[PDB]
Every structure is written in C-alpha cells, then in structure tokens.
Structure 1
Amino acid sequence: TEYKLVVVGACGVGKSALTIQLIQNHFVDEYDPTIEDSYRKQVVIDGETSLLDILDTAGQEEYSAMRDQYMRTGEGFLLVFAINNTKSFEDIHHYREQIKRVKDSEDVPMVLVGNKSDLPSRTVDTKQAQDLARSYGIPFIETSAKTRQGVDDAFYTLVREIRKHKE
C-alpha cells in the first residue's frame, strides 16, 4: 500500500522542517521556501508496511488546471500552522477550502498540525486548535520538527484517516 500525503500551510510554519525531519531524521534551521519536492519513506503502521509519498508544497500560489490536478492526487493532507503565529492559524481556513474544492468532498482525510511546540512564545492555545479540529471532525496533533515531538504521530494519524476512508 502507498499513501500520497500532502503537507500544506502558510509560509514559515515548518512544512519543510517537518518533512525533512520525517525523511532525513534531522532538523533544518533554514530551507529555501521555493523548494518543492516529493519524498518516499517506508514505514510500519499498525503492523502494515506501507510506502508514504510526501509532497512538501512550496513556492507561490497557482490556480491552474495543472496545479489543481496535481493537488487532487493527494489522498490526505496535513494542515500545518505554527503555535506562535496566529495568522498561520487563521490561514488554515483557506487551505481547507482549496482541498474541499479540488477533492470535491467534505470528508477528505486531514490532520491539523500545530508545529513549533518546542517554542515558549505560544499565541495559539491548544484548546483553540482542538475546538476548531472538533468542529471540522479531524484529529489535532502538536509537533516539533526540531525535537521530533509528534512527527511520526502526525503522519501516521493521517495514514490511519486515509485507511478508514478507503476501507
């Protein structure tokens, strides 16, 4: 089994850092915000070996048929915000709207991810993110790409959401 996962969210939330921690087992202090790539990782989740194909979205917005088609290939989406950036949390609505549009569905596998959980400067309350996740009917996971907190849990939770949706 192979799962196409797409990491989305505003600039600077840690999409690349999360992806590179997952794939390469190290934290990036800076990562060019124009670099977009897909990465593969073999994992075992609930006793089943699977291949994750992870798209780390980057660059500028693009509302073309080709870009929509590419994003539509995603089976599940990580909605990433940073816990020290309220605007990034505000932006989650936009990302969800675009996913709902291209997937033409209200039941797309998604996980809300509050990244940078290692930092002291929190501006988004855990309870606020949990309330919105509850309203959306999706899991919420706090992560740190720096320390590895929650990283596997975020991606593996998303896989579990996909498995439930496709079986």
Structure 2
Amino acid sequence: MTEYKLVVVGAGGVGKSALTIQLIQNHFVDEYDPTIEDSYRKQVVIDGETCLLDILDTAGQEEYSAMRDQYMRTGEGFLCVFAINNTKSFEDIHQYREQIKRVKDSDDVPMVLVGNKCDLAARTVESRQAQDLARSYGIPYIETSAKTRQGVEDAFYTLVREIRQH
C-alpha cells in the first residue's frame, strides 16, 4: 500500500484547501478551513497498489511556526500552489522553495509548481515566464481550478508519480 504526504504550500487565498477536499469529498467549498489545521486523508489506486494519499494543508492563524518545520522534514511531496491572478503567490513560491531545501538540506525535492484559479481573473502569470521559473528548478509545471475540477487530476497524479520514481 505505502503512503505519501502531500506537503502543500503556496500563498494564502490561492484555493489550496478547496482543491484538496475536492479530490476527496468532491464539492467546491468556499472555505472549509479558514483557520483549521487538520490533515486530510483519502486512499485510492493510482495505477499502483492503493497508495494512501494523506494530504496536508496549512491555515495561517498565529505566527510562531513549529509543525511547519517538522512538516518539511516529514512530508516529501510539495504541491507549491500559486494563484495566477494576484501574483503574490508567484513571489511566494520563490521563497517557499528555499525553506524546503533548508529542512532536507538539499536541492532535489519532488516539487510541483501548480497554478490555481486559472478559471478567471485575467492571466496575470502567462505560462511562458512561469515555464522558465520551474524549468530552472527542474520541477513540473501545471494549471488548476477547483471551480471546475480542471487540472486537479494532473496535479495530484503527477505528484505521486515524481515521489514514486524517485
């Protein structure tokens, strides 16, 4: 069976939780955890052996840090969400990919720069400049929008595909 932890991170307001719960319960949630810090679990068979997928999401309440540090050292998959409408998510990926290298103390994670919220808000982040951002780190690039379940499949699936082959 084996199990994997989807260490998700990427700005606050990109749609990272509504995206996770979507693949699980399947339902566009406007806010199913505006301040909750619980781990989501959903087991399925991704053409393997029923690999349990324990997704991990953040919240933002308080600001002392503690489990986040031990989350980069425990989990391994990095779904770096980034909304392509506000742009602050892109600048947030340029720093969240340094602390992960801090914890593991290495530059070779199964990172995954996924752009969410591409179903609206004029494309502020085209796929060209974004293609050169992830291409430099050797990480896969994808698009996503839980508002219509578009791209959500290529994100989660490609995530377990990078951790497995690794």
Q: 1:100 to 1:45 in 2, by over 3 A?
A: same
Deviation at 1:30, TM superposition (A): 3.0
Deviations 1:121-149 (A, max 9, x none): 22111112111111110111100111001
Structure 1 residue 113: Cα displacement: 0.5
Task: Structure 2: give runs of 5+ residues left out of the alignment.
Answer: none
1:45/1:112 CA distance change after superposition, 3 Å: same
- RMSD across aligned positions (CA): 1.7
**1:25-65 Cα distance to aligned partner (Å, 9 max, x none):** 01112344311221111122234321001001112475655
Secondary structure of the 1:3 match is: strand
CA-CA distance at 1:9 after TM superposition: 0.8
- Give the aligned length: 165
SS in 1 for 2:50: strand
- Residue 101 of structure 1 deviates from its aligned partner by 0.6
**Conserved 8 A contact 2:79-2:113:** yes
Q: CA deviation at 1:67?
A: 3.7
**Which residue in the other structure is 2:150 paired with?**
149
Of stretches 136-145 and 42-51 in structure 1, the one that deviates more from structure 2 is 42-51
Aligned mates of 1:59, 1:49 — CA distance in 2: 32
Q: Does the CA contact (< 8 Å) of 1:11 and 1:33 recur in 2?
A: no
Q: Which has the higher strand share?
A: 1
Residues 116 and 143, structure 1, Cα contact 8 Å, conserved in 2? yes
Q: Percent identity?
A: 92
The normalised TM-score by structure 2 is 0.91
Q: Contact 1:36–1:56 at 8 Å: present in 2 too?
A: yes
1:85–1:124 CA contact under 8 A, matched in 2: no
CA gap 1:67/1:143 in 2 versus in 1, 3 angstroms:
closer
TM superposition score normalised by structure 1: 0.90
- Partners of 2:111 and 2:151 in 1: CA distance: 16
Output the CA distance in 2 between the equivalents of 1:64 and 1:120: 32
Q: Secondary structure at the match of 2:82?
A: strand
Quick one: structure 1 residues 103 and 61, their matched pair in 2 at CA, closer, same or farther if it must change by over 3 Å? Answer: farther
Identify unmatched segments of 5+ residues in structure 1.
none
Equivalent residue, structure 1, for 2:46: 45
Aligned to 2:4: 3
Q: After the TM superposition, which of the residue ranges 46-55 and 91-100 deviates more from structure 2?
A: 46-55
3-state secondary structure, aligned to 1:48: coil
